């Protein structure tokens, strides 16, 4: 939204389990939800290509 987010603001995505608070927060700005699998550098480069 405004300030570069600290790691605390990053929320953990919950696939396949009941997590209705994040569903209610879809239109919210700051609590960004990220998937667990971080992209490796080679796949990063291929996607960039």
């Amino acid at each position: 939204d405004r300030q570069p987010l600290n790691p605390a603001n990053i929320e953990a995505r919950h696939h396949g389990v009941s997590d209705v608070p994040r569903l209610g927060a879809m239109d919210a700005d700051e609590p960004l939800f990220v998937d667990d699998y971080r992209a490796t550098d080679d796949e990063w480069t291929l996607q960039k290509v």
């Binding site: 790691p7 953990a12 919950h14 696939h15 396949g16 389990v17 009941s18 667990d36 699998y37």
Partner: protein
């Protein structure tokens, strides 16, 4: 809070009391208390239940060990002050070849900590290498000039009794990280040059901080490896029983825990809806 399946009340309360009494006892490593690990109940309860038990015990242990958080900022400040003092002594002292002393003082004289847990160990390693090489050059003892074979960290000119005491204290530091105590080395003032006195105090402080941080890191590494392996084995075992509650348990456990805060989040979510998936685990 920590709660788990099937075990009798007395064993559970004994284990949770063990966790809170972790600081006062020596030998903080979980492997040093095998009875607690075996208290999970192998051959007593079903294999998936005992895997869940062991994963819970490991995760609670990690929570406590991270929470104790040996933030030794006071020792950091004292080390910084000693570093400034050693820099001043390096400035005032004469040498047979001044250029090398000036270069090592220049790599020494600006080493303020970058307020990160990881960076402090490597920067203090480099500063300690510089301090030791400066001390050895000051005494005009031989120094290893072989390429790549950098000078090792060691005391100089200290008596065998004192170095034995210091090494035993550092071994105790390795045995228990959370509440280590400093020392004054019982250092003499009549004998030996003063610059060696200062650098010896500095190198003792650096050895202590490196040892405590390295021990905490080693315990974290071992705990993360064990919890990852336990989670992998448990999910493989439970995958065979395709059912709603079992699949919910799988979807909980599928999260990675490579970063400690992610492991804490996994603990939080695993506790939050325990009643939903408990039926998959057979008691007794």
């Amino acid at each position: 809070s920590l709660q788990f399946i099937g075990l009798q009340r007395r064993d559970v309360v004994a284990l949770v009391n063990f966790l809170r009494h972790l600081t006062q006892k020596p030998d903080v490593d979980l492997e040093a208390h095998p009875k607690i690990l075996k208290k999970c109940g192998e051959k007593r309860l079903h294999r998936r239940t005992v895997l869940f038990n062991e994963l819970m015990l490991w995760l609670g242990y990690y929570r406590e060990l991270r929470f104790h958080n040996p933030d030794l900022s006071s020792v950091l400040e004292e080390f910084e002050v000693r570093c400034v003092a050693v820099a001043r002594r390096g400035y005032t002292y004469p040498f047979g070849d001044r250029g090398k002393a000036r270069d090592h003082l220049a790599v020494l004289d600006r080493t303020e900590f970058d307020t990160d847990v990881r960076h402090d160990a490597e920067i203090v390693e480099r500063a300690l290498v510089s301090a030791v090489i400066l001390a050895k050059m000051s005494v005009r003892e031989t120094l290893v000039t072989a390429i790549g074979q950098t000078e090792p960290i060691a005391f100089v000119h200290l008596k065998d009794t004192e170095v034995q005491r210091i090494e035993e204290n550092l071994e105790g530091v390795r045995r228990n990280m959370f509440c280590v105590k400093p020392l004054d080395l019982n250092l003499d003032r009549h004998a030996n040059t003063a610059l060696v006195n200062a650098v010896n105090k500095l190198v003792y402080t650096g050895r202590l901080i490196m040892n405590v941080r390295r021990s905490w890191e080693e315990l974290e590494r071992k705990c993360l490896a064990r919890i990852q392996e336990r989670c992998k084995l448990l999910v493989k075992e439970l995958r065979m029983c395709l059912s709603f509650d079992s699949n919910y348990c799988r979807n909980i456990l599928k999260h990675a825990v490579e970063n400690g805060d992610s492991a804490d989040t996994l603990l939080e979510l695993l506790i939050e809806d325990f009643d939903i998936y408990v039926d998959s685990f057979p008691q007794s």
